[PDB]
Amino acid sequence: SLALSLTADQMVSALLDAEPPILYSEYDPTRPSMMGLLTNLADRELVHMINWAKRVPGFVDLTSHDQVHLLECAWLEILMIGLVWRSMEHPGKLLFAPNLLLDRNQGGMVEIFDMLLATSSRFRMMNLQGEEFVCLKSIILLNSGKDHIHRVLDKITDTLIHLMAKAGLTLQQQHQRLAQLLLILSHIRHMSNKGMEHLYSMVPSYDLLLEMLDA
Amino acid sequence: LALSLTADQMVSALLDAEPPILYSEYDPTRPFSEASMMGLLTNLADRELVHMINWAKRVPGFVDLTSHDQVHLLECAWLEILMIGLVWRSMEHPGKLLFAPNLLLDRMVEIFDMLLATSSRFRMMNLQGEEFVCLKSIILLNSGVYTFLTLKSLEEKDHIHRVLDKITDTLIHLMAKAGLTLQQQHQRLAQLLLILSHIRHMSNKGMEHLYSMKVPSYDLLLEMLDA
Ligand SMILES: CN(C)CCOc1ccc(C2=C(c3ccc(O)cc3)[C@@H]3C[C@@H](S(=O)(=O)Oc4ccc(Br)cc4)[C@H]2O3)cc1
Ligand SMILES: CN(C)CCOc1ccc(C2=C(c3ccc(O)cc3)[C@@H]3C[C@@H](S(=O)(=O)Oc4ccc(Br)cc4)[C@H]2O3)cc1
């Protein structure tokens, strides 16, 4: 409701404020296992994601059932785009955590690793902005999982275009960049799908996410 | 040169390059079994793949790439391309999937529903044929582009993004010609491209269940391109 009256600037500021912190993996630096560190990290990241999602404009207007469905579909995509975003300044490496920086040598699992690296390289080449990044995350949340959702998605599109226009991009450059960003989301969906496979080759259930949202 | 075309030239090229609608095996044993229907769909897809290569080679910019890169794009995109074609054919048939004119099926059920929802989505958006062929070309060029390598490889990936930008210009031009406002233009462009992520999802789920007891090799795709 109120999310549909939000301006582009208000949408950006809201998403920037809802942004989760960068968490550390739990290991002792005084000491001389990887999948355990990632699992522990992803579990703590999940808690912050639920609170982030609740602060995404229009999301709370949805029924509790629809909120869970979106999170169930998007959670791995959200984690992955976050990883890719914070790894953007580290070519050839993935920054899972500030104290957990890995290259493909240490790295299902190499296939996904390379796809993650390629996305990070793509973001860096496009000079993806933080304001654009938070918009993409919100898009992933709302799109991966109907009328209200699509109105909000149109708002985020307006927000992206407004950001580009403010940055001095021409009208042609605006829709081109918009297209480039949204097409990357297809690769992110692909990575998540491949990712789920290897997670069933050893995940928050519907009830788990419902209980977290209620809290 | 694909980058020299105009929006109208691009549309005309894509429309002319459209593959034919094929028929599945005539008069199969009905009712179907799980095996017999998969046999029909497999035979149909195999014959469709032939015309897809012919189509792909006529997509502006595609033949400019090395044969190796062309195969890689097809490897990543072929199922997506088959599925969006299916979704397009099924638009005027609510609740049904038109795999072929002689194979219209109503309500692997999960993928069926995802395909129905995508078809209804295209129907609700009033997707145009001109828009459709643009989206299909985008899939071909984009689905495998994020997995390239040298200076030559840098030029290859760079060339693809330019053609992709060109198709974006073409989609926008179609929308502006239709009379849509600039706001409606950016919004509709976004809606169409977000659907491509769903098509990716259905393709991945499709690949999964295909490996589940039920894919064209590099050598096959390469040979057909050379043929
Ligand atoms: C109860 N549940 C919530 C438990 C979930 O536990 C999990 C959940 C996710 C993960 C993984 C990753 C991940 C975790 C947090 C994050 O901020 C970014 C990425 C990356 C992607 C996937 S993958 O396993 O799907 O892909 C990769 C595999 C190996 C490597 Br190296 C890189 C990626 C795997 O590595 C690991 C354990
Ligand atoms: C290249 N060759 C070596 C191998 C090709 O073999 C294949 C290739 C494709 C297919 C399938 C489909 C398909 C075929 C042609 C087409 O124009 C559109 C879709 C649909 C989607 C998938 S699915 O089996 O993954 O999804 C569905 C399942 C059931 C139903 Br009903 C509908 C979809 C399956 O049914 C089956 C066998």
Folded structure, characterized:
- Chain A: This is Estrogen receptor.
- Chain A: It is found in: Nucleus; Golgi apparatus; Cell membrane.
- Chain A: Belongs to the nuclear hormone receptor family. NR3 subfamily.
- The structure is a homodimer.
- By secondary structure, chain A is mostly helical.
- Chain A has one domain: Retinoid X Receptor (Orthogonal Bundle).
- Chain A is built from eight helices and two strands, in the order H-H-H-E-E-H-H-H-H-H.
- In chain A, strands 1-2 form a two-stranded antiparallel ribbon.
- In chain A, a hairpin with a 2-residue loop joins strand 1 and strand 2.
- The longest helix of chain A is centred in the C-terminal third of the chain and has 29 residues.
- The radius of gyration of chain A is 17 Å and the shape is globular.
- The two termini of chain A are 23 Å apart.
- At the A-B interface, helix 4, helix 6 and helix 7 of A face helix 6 and helix 7 of B.
- One ligand 7EB binds next to helix 2, helix 3, helix 4 and helix 7 of chain A.
Secondary structure class of chain A reads mainly alpha
- The coarse overall form of chain A would be globular
CATH homologous superfamily placement of chain A: Retinoid X Receptor
Total domains of chain A, how many?
Answer: 1
Q: Total helix count of chain A?
A: 8
**Spatial order of strands in the largest sheet of chain A:** 1-2
PDB class: transcription
Keywords: Nuclear receptor, transcription factor, ligand binding, protein-ligand complex, transcription
Assembly: dimeric
Entry title: Crystal Structure of the ER-alpha Ligand-binding Domain (L372S,L536S) in Complex with the OBHS-BSC, 4-bromophenyl (1R,2R,4S)-6-(4-(2-(dimethylamino)ethoxy)phenyl)-5-(4-hydroxyphenyl)-7-oxabicyclo[2.2.1]hept-5-ene-2-sulfonate
